[PDB]
């Protein structure tokens, strides 16, 4: 139904602003907010139908000691949306404590926008893992959304800012935030800026404006993930129906992302299918195995040899699903939206529950573990000591994430007829 | 002119003695039927009035002469057969379909007809013809799909009526655009396809049973040069590999002659003679005509099957009373190989 | 346009429409429709289109509408929940099973032939042959859909797994559902093993 | 079916790179890897059908202390193939020991490419006999392929680098490597760089770029040997069916090579037939006698007087086959491939099992024997002493190769109804 977007952190506000400019260009709206004569799809999933004959977008901007938010403000896409939800450290404990002291009025901002809608389906959060101002604050307020709203769904869009390796307090913040993402979130979309940056430097000659083009990539992935909700389709035009199928267990809910065009400067669905299974197309990268795969393909093709393509991929015999489960690739087809010129309009995406990310979780675990062993790279700020003098929250996050790694490895194996 | 059939009111449908004149020869009477059939399938309408005037001229004359009349019917026939040739060669791509017919019938492609034997070895037994029948088509389509060929594999199909030697290949052609291919033509093609399949089937056994170098002399000093089958393995291979290199020439000569003949002629009726010679030459030169010499070749193929079955299980050299079978094999091979050199004398 | 609108009424906007039925009153349905079994929902055919669109066409649209409500009931009921662990085993073994099933009915039948049928109706040239092109769509899509052919050998599995969608909602015992499921699933496969060529698009799991 | 190419050694990597550039020019592929619009033959014998709509060649490059491999790398035909199998002394014992210490990860490279294929037919090895870095390493890893894979076929392409005489440790390395080629290989193609270099200096005015044109000659011989597999033909479109007919005994499996055009800057098959039997056409050169001869002719000719040409050659009465066996010249015909301009498109090749190479084996045997007698030209490095203090591997190789010489001489005679 109606889904409210919450953006916090500098990186989260940046990718949210890029996404809102993307939907401004996509749908028939001005940079003013008014509906145009090239509007008619559903425009009530992200835009509040306002009383100005303006489809005013539901964009809740929160920040802590803002810098780039002022550069967002002096632009014609910060008066695109203004329903009065615009509001004005570098550690997880410091951001947690600073979010603690000002939680009331921004939670009143959340409450005002929550009753302002006719209906509610989900709160989707723009976040960056250990992004500084976003970290700690986002974990605390994520806990407060899961506490205050048990009837609604929480989605988290999170990126890991790393320029191919690194901050020494970053594994602590990622461990603590990942504990919050495990137990206070319903679905977490995780991306690696290292792999995306390497693919971006490969595909073009972009090396200095890598982050700006990464914003375009994340905006296209976000718009393609919600296109079947924004545009009239058939299935899972709520968030929860889309989220439900990929998750077999509520702790394996971290989804790997895929994207078919490696540059966008006429094929059948068979080619992009056998493409996107292979890890030249995965932008976020024992043998670790998929639990469930969901694919969304958007392009100008003639959709009947999809059953033929499923025949061909089946007996090409590339990939097998999980021992205990009779799982299956789940496939949806949509149209690529007009009002943006794109050569080769075929664009594919996969949303897949993969165990490979467990290794990367263990990678962060190993980093945190060695910094826990040396104890010269926790950097000893007074906010961290005042927040937790015993640092047993790190031990709780560590034991939960180690149970998560064991659950990952047991779900890969047929030890999910047993327990691990 | 109009192509009308049943213009006879009892004084596709066949010829009859009451409608056949014998003072006008039979060879022109067949050409009249050909001219009549071809209109319904045509540039005869364009010159039609010219051919009307001739006939009306022939209506006026009080005397009849066979000499003038035969020229008129043959000239009409000439233009009609030319009209058929002009369309089938160019707009229906008859030559490119001949390439497909060659590729799947004379086994001029080898990917499918090697992988099919690799992915099915259960048609050595007798078929119930309702489970095996589904299975051969399934194996065919699955084998094709690995590397490309999303295009065709609509025209060729299998038709099983052991299970390798009662298997057929059911085809399809464009029936309005081709009349040169009927059930009898593809039936002859089915027969030659089955014989070439039999030979390809035994060569798969010969290459599989060959592991003399791979494991049977490698890393082992084996029991060879004490207990061994004298290496008749090498000798049985040559007599069929040589007949089979010969089969390659037997096919390729006729194929080159066909694709040379079709360019020269420009009437469909002459093309019919060329093709009816093509098939008849292929038949007798491959000895598919039942002869004692062909039965000697079939006896050789039976002994090859029986010998490959022993050397498959034998792996490292062993007497398991296999010498009893080997004695029969060397006797029969010597006797029939001697008869292979009385057919040249 | 009306013929399009029928198969988008029977069968975004409709998700709001469906959740109210997830939660008989004949006026509530009427005001909701103008804004799984039972359900009086219809629209009047005016007479210039009532002489082309037949009365028995609405019944076929209603068959597939009622069946789609039952499919989405099972699918949504296993999608609205967040021996002990065995529930999760019973979840994915059934949540896949309906999702494949809904993938067969829509994509292979109601999206292929409908995308063709628009191209079909634009090639009709009169009132009269429009009727025949329409009736040669209805009586064959009603045959491809499992409503009238082998509806006690294939369909009974689809019906008996709908009871699991109610039992699993109550449970949110556990072994008595998967012993039923592995029974009827293998029954379906050992009857579906005859693949007649169209059966293969689902003779897959 | 699908055949994987393994190249090791500097000379082996050079001739493999030349062969891959030859097939890049031959088939419809870019220097990028993508299929072109002039592709349609079989392209799955050497090129993995990859998911990029690229026919990415199966080229496994291994090396030990590389020099020229870097010059191979900075070229547009080293990004022609990249399935991630690219990896980075002068004695047989030293190369053996250095191959021993790093065998695991490069064998994992072999295993990754082996399971990466849909099917496997053979591993064909690019090698140079006593090439320094290639020798010892190649023998050890050849033993490990024959140990680990008994179901697959091993072919070895080997050249003897000698600038018309010479290295004093070269007969030892050739004796030991020839022992490995006897008992761990299924077919060995042996060439003489002396005879090829003399013919190359004769045919043109090439004397300083002799090695580069020798790479072209070896690439044409390799492409012509596999043309009937790459292009749709009739017979032996697996490796094993081609290999099977020439070998009567698995120790006589060393094949003499022939090549009809002496320069390539319209004839019948009769002329090239009566040409290629005579040793002006043999590029690698009691009276020593053929056991079996196989011929492949590729050219634009009209193939029916081949039976007439067999008539004429039969009763010209030039050559006789072996006493014990009713052997025969075995003949196959193919077409010379397009996309390379070649005046006089008739090109003939012979693959023949000849006993004449036994004399050349004995030549190496004699050289090794005299250096074994003098013991001032084994050059006494510590790797050779540490590998074998007793040097009984040379005695084992010597007794096996002497039994091979006796088996050669007895197969020439009618003493192969008896044993020798």
From Swiss-Prot, chains A, D:
The protein's matches in InterPro entries, at most eight in alphabetical order, are given as: Gamma_tubulin, Tub_FtsZ_C, Tubulin, Tubulin/FtsZ-like_C, Tubulin/FtsZ_2-layer-sand-dom, Tubulin/FtsZ_GTPase_sf, Tubulin_C, Tubulin_CS
Determine the domain of life of the protein's source.
Eukaryota
Which keywords belong to this entry? Cytoplasm, Cytoskeleton, Disease variant, GTP-binding, Lissencephaly, Microtubule, Nucleotide-binding, Phosphoprotein
Entries under Pfam families matching the protein: Tubulin, Tubulin_C
| Cellular component terms (Gene Ontology) | apical part of cell; cell leading edge; centriole; centrosome; ciliary basal body; condensed nuclear chromosome; cytoplasm; cytoplasmic microtubule
User: Where does it primarily localize?
Assistant: cytoplasm
Task: Kindly indicate whether the keyword Cytoplasm belongs to this entry.
Answer: yes
Subcellular location per the Swiss-Prot or TrEMBL entry: Cytoplasm, Cytoskeleton, Microtubule organizing center, Centrosome; Cytoplasm, Cytoskeleton, Spindle
Q: Does the keyword Secreted apply?
A: no
**Which ranges form a coiled coil?**
none
What does its PTM field state? Answer: Phosphorylation at Ser-119 by BRSK1 regulates centrosome duplication, possibly by mediating relocation of gamma-tubulin and its associated proteins from the cytoplasm to the centrosome.
For this protein, the parts annotated as crossing the membrane are none
UniProt GO BP: cytoplasmic microtubule organization; meiotic spindle organization; microtubule cytoskeleton organization; microtubule nucleation; mitotic cell cycle; mitotic sister chromatid segregation; mitotic spindle organization
Q: How does it assemble?
A: Component of the gamma-tubulin ring complex (gTuRC) consisting of TUBGCP2, TUBGCP3, TUBGCP4, TUBGCP5 and TUBGCP6 and gamma-tubulin TUBG1 or TUBG2. TUBGCP2, TUBGCP3, TUBGCP4, TUBGCP5 and TUBGCP6 assemble in a 5:5:2:1:1 stoichiometry; each is associated with a gamma-tubulin, thereby arranging 14 gamma-tubulins in a helical manner. Gamma-tubulin at the first position is blocked by TUBGCP3 at the last position, allowing 13 protafilaments to grow into a microtubule.
Q: Which PANTHER family match?
A: TUBULIN
- Tell me the protein family, please: Belongs to the tubulin family.
Q: What is the protein's name according to its record?
A: Tubulin gamma-1 chain
Q: Which organism is it from?
A: Homo sapiens (Human)
Originating gene = TUBG1
Curated annotation (Swiss-Prot), chain B:
The GO terms this record gives for MF are:
gamma-tubulin binding; structural constituent of cytoskeleton
Could you provide one GO biological process annotation from this protein's UniProt record? cytoplasmic microtubule organization
* Tissue specificity note: Ubiquitously expressed.
Question: Where in the cell?
Answer: Cytoplasm, Cytoskeleton, Microtubule organizing center, Centrosome
- Cellular component per GO? centrosome; cytosol; gamma-tubulin complex; gamma-tubulin ring complex; membrane; microtubule; microtubule cytoskeleton; recycling endosome
Transmembrane portions of the chain: none
Keywords assigned by UniProt?
Answer: Cytoplasm, Cytoskeleton, Intellectual disability, Microtubule, Primary microcephaly
Q: What disease is this chain connected with?
A: Microcephaly and chorioretinopathy, autosomal recessive, 3: A disorder characterized by congenital microcephaly and chorioretinal dysplasia associated with poor vision and nystagmus. Variable ocular anomalies include microphthalmia, retinal folding, retinal detachment, optic nerve hypoplasia, absence of retinal vessels, round areas of chorioretinal atrophy, and attenuated electroretinogram. Most patients have mild developmental delay and mild learning difficulties.
Subunit structure, as described in the record? Component of the gamma-tubulin ring complex (gTuRC) consisting of TUBGCP2, TUBGCP3, TUBGCP4, TUBGCP5 and TUBGCP6 and gamma-tubulin TUBG1 or TUBG2. TUBGCP2, TUBGCP3, TUBGCP4, TUBGCP5 and TUBGCP6 assemble in a 5:5:2:1:1 stoichiometry; each is associated with a gamma-tubulin, thereby arranging 14 gamma-tubulins in a helical manner. Gamma-tubulin at the first position is blocked by TUBGCP3 at the last position, allowing 13 protafilaments to grow into a microtubule.
Q: What does this protein do?
A: Component of the gamma-tubulin ring complex (gTuRC) which mediates microtubule nucleation. The gTuRC regulates the minus-end nucleation of alpha-beta tubulin heterodimers that grow into microtubule protafilaments, a critical step in centrosome duplication and spindle formation.
Q: Which family does it belong to?
A: Belongs to the TUBGCP family.
Query: In the UniProt record, what gene is named as encoding this protein?
Result: TUBGCP4
From Swiss-Prot, chain C:
**Which compartments is it annotated to reside in?**
Cytoplasm, Cytoskeleton, Microtubule organizing center, Centrosome
Regions annotated as coiled coil: none
Q: Which domain of life is it from?
A: Eukaryota
What does the entry state regarding organ or tissue expression? Widely expressed, with highest levels in heart and skeletal muscle and moderate levels in brain.
Under the subunit heading, UniProt states: Component of the gamma-tubulin ring complex (gTuRC) consisting of TUBGCP2, TUBGCP3, TUBGCP4, TUBGCP5 and TUBGCP6 and gamma-tubulin TUBG1 or TUBG2. TUBGCP2, TUBGCP3, TUBGCP4, TUBGCP5 and TUBGCP6 assemble in a 5:5:2:1:1 stoichiometry; each is associated with a gamma-tubulin, thereby arranging 14 gamma-tubulins in a helical manner. Gamma-tubulin at the first position is blocked by TUBGCP3 at the last position, allowing 13 protafilaments to grow into a microtubule.
Function of the molecule: Component of the gamma-tubulin ring complex (gTuRC) which mediates microtubule nucleation. The gTuRC regulates the minus-end nucleation of alpha-beta tubulin heterodimers that grow into microtubule protafilaments, a critical step in centrosome duplication and spindle formation.
Family note: Belongs to the TUBGCP family.
Question: What's the protein here called?
Answer: Gamma-tubulin complex component 5
Q: What is the lineage of its organism?
A: Eukaryota, Metazoa, Chordata, Craniata, Vertebrata
User: Whole protein: which stretch is covered?
Assistant: 718 to 1016 of 1024
């Amino acid at each position: 139904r109606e889904i409210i977007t919450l953006q916090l952190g500098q990186c989260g506000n940046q990718i949210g602003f890029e996404f809102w400019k993307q939907l401004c260009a996509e749908h028939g709206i001005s940079p003013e907010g008014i509906v145009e004569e090239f509007a008619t799809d559903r425009k009530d999933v992200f835009f509040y139908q306002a009383d100005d004959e303006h489809y005013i977008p539901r964009a809740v901007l929160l920040d802590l000691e803002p810098r780039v938010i002022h550069s967002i403000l002096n632009s014609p896409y910060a008066k695109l949306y203004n329903p009065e939800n615009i509001y004005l450290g570098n550690n997880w404990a410091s951001g947690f404590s600073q979010g603690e002291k000002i939680h009331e009025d921004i939670f009143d901002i959340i409450d005002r926008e929550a009753d302002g809608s006719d209906s509610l389906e989900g709160f989707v959060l723009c976040h960056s893992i250990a992004g500084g101002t976003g970290s700690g604050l986002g974990s605390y307020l994520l806990e407060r959304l899961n506490d205050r709203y048990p009837k609604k769904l929480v989605q988290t869009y999170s990126v890991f800012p790393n320029q191919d390796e690194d901050v020494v307090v970053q594994p602590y913040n990622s461990l603590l935030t990942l504990k919050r993402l495990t137990q206070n979130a319903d679905c977490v979309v995780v991306l690696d800026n290292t792999a995306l940056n390497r693919i971006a430097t490969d595909r073009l000659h972009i090396q200095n404006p890598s982050f700006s083009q990464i914003n375009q990539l994340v905006s296209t992935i976000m718009s393609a993930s919600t296109t079947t909700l924004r545009y009239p389709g058939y299935m899972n035009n709520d968030l929860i129906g889309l989220i439900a199928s990929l998750i077999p267990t509520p702790r394996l809910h971290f989804l790997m992302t895929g994207y078919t065009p490696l540059t966008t400067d006429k094929t059948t669905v068979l080619d992009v299918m056998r493409r996107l299974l292979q890890p030249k197309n995965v932008m976020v990268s024992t043998n670790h195995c998929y639990i469930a795969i969901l694919n969304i393909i958007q392009g100008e093709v003639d959709p009947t040899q999809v059953h033929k393509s499923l025949q061909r991929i089946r007996e090409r015999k590339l990939a097998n699903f999980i021992p205990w489960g009779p799982a299956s690739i789940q496939v949806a087809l949509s149209r690529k939206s007009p009002y943006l010129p794109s050569a080769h309009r075929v664009s594919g995406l996969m949303m897949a529950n993969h165990t490979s990310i467990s290794s990367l979780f263990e990678r962060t675990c190993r980093q945190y573990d060695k910094l826990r062993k040396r104890e010269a790279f926790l950097e000893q700020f007074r906010k961290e000591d005042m927040f937790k003098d015993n640092f047993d929250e790190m031990d709780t996050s560590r034991e939960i994430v180690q149970q998560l790694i064991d659950e990952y490895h047991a779900a890969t194996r047929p030890d999910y007829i047993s327990w691990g | 002119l109009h192509g009308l059939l049943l213009d006879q009111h009892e004084e596709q449908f066949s010829l009859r003695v009451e409608i056949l004149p014998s003072y006008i020869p039979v060879r022109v009477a067949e050409k009249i039927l050909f001219v009549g059939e071809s209109v319904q399938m045509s540039i005869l309408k364009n010159q039609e009035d010219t051919f009307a005037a001739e006939l009306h001229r022939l209506k006026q004359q009080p005397l009849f002469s066979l000499v003038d009349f035969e020229q008129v019917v043959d000239r009409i026939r000439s233009t009609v057969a030319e009209h058929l040739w002009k369309l089938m060669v160019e707009e229906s791509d008859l030559l490119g379909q001949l390439k497909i017919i060659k590729d799947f019938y004379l086994l001029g492609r080898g990917e499918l007809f090697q992988a099919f034997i690799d992915t099915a070895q259960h048609m050595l037994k007798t078929p119930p013809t309702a489970v095996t029948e589904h299975d051969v088509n399934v194996a065919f389509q699955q084998s094709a799909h690995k590397v490309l060929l999303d295009d065709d594999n609509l025209l060729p199909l299998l038709h099983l009526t052991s299970g390798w030697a009662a298997l057929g290949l059911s085809y399809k052609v464009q029936w309005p655009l081709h009349i040169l291919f009927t059930p009898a033509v593809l039936e002859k093609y089915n027969v030659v396809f089955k014989y070439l399949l039999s030979v390809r089937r035994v060569q798969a056994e010969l290459q599989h049973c060959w592991a003399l170098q791979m494991q049977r002399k490698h890393l082992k000093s084996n029991q060879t040069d004490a207990i061994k089958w004298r290496l008749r393995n090498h000798m049985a291979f040559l007599v069929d590999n040589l007949q089979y290199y010969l089969q390659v020439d037997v096919l390729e000569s006729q194929f080159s002659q066909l694709l040379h003949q079709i360019n020269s002629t420009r009437d469909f009726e002459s093309i019919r003679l060329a093709h009816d010679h093509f098939l008849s030459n292929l038949l007798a030169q491959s000895f598919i005509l039942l002869k004692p010499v062909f039965h000697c070749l079939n006896e050789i193929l039976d002994l090859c099957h029986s010998f490959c079955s022993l050397v498959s299980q034998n792996l490292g050299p062993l007497d398991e009373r296999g010498a009893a079978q080997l004695s029969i094999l060397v006797k029969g091979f010597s006797r029939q190989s001697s008869l292979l050199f009385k057919i040249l004398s | 346009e009306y013929l399009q609108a029928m198969r988008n009424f029977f069968l975004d906007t409709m998700y709001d429409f469906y959740t109210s039925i997830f939660d008989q009153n004949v006026s509530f349905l009427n005001v909701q429709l103008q804004e799984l079994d039972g359900l009086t929902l219809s629209y009047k055919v005016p007479w210039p289109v009532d002489i082309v669109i037949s009365l028995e066409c609405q019944k076929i649209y209603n068959q597939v509408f009622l069946l789609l409500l039952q499919i989405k009931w099972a699918k949504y009921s296993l999608d609205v929940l967040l021996q002990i662990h065995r529930m999760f085993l019973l979840r994915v073994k059934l949540m896949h099973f309906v999702n494949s099933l809904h993938n067969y009915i829509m994509t292979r039948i109601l999206h292929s032939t409908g995308l063709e049928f628009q191209h079909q109706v634009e090639e009709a040239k009169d009132l009269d042959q429009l009727i025949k092109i329409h009736y040669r769509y209805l009586s064959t899509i009603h045959d491809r859909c499992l409503l009238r052919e082998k509806v006690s050998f294939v369909k009974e599995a689809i019906m008996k797994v709908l009871n699991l969608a109610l039992m699993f909602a109550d449970g949110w015992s556990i072994e008595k559902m998967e012993s039923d499921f592995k029974n009827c699933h293998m029954f379906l496969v050992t009857i579906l093993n005859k693949a007649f060529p169209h059966l293969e698009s689902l003779a897959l799991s």
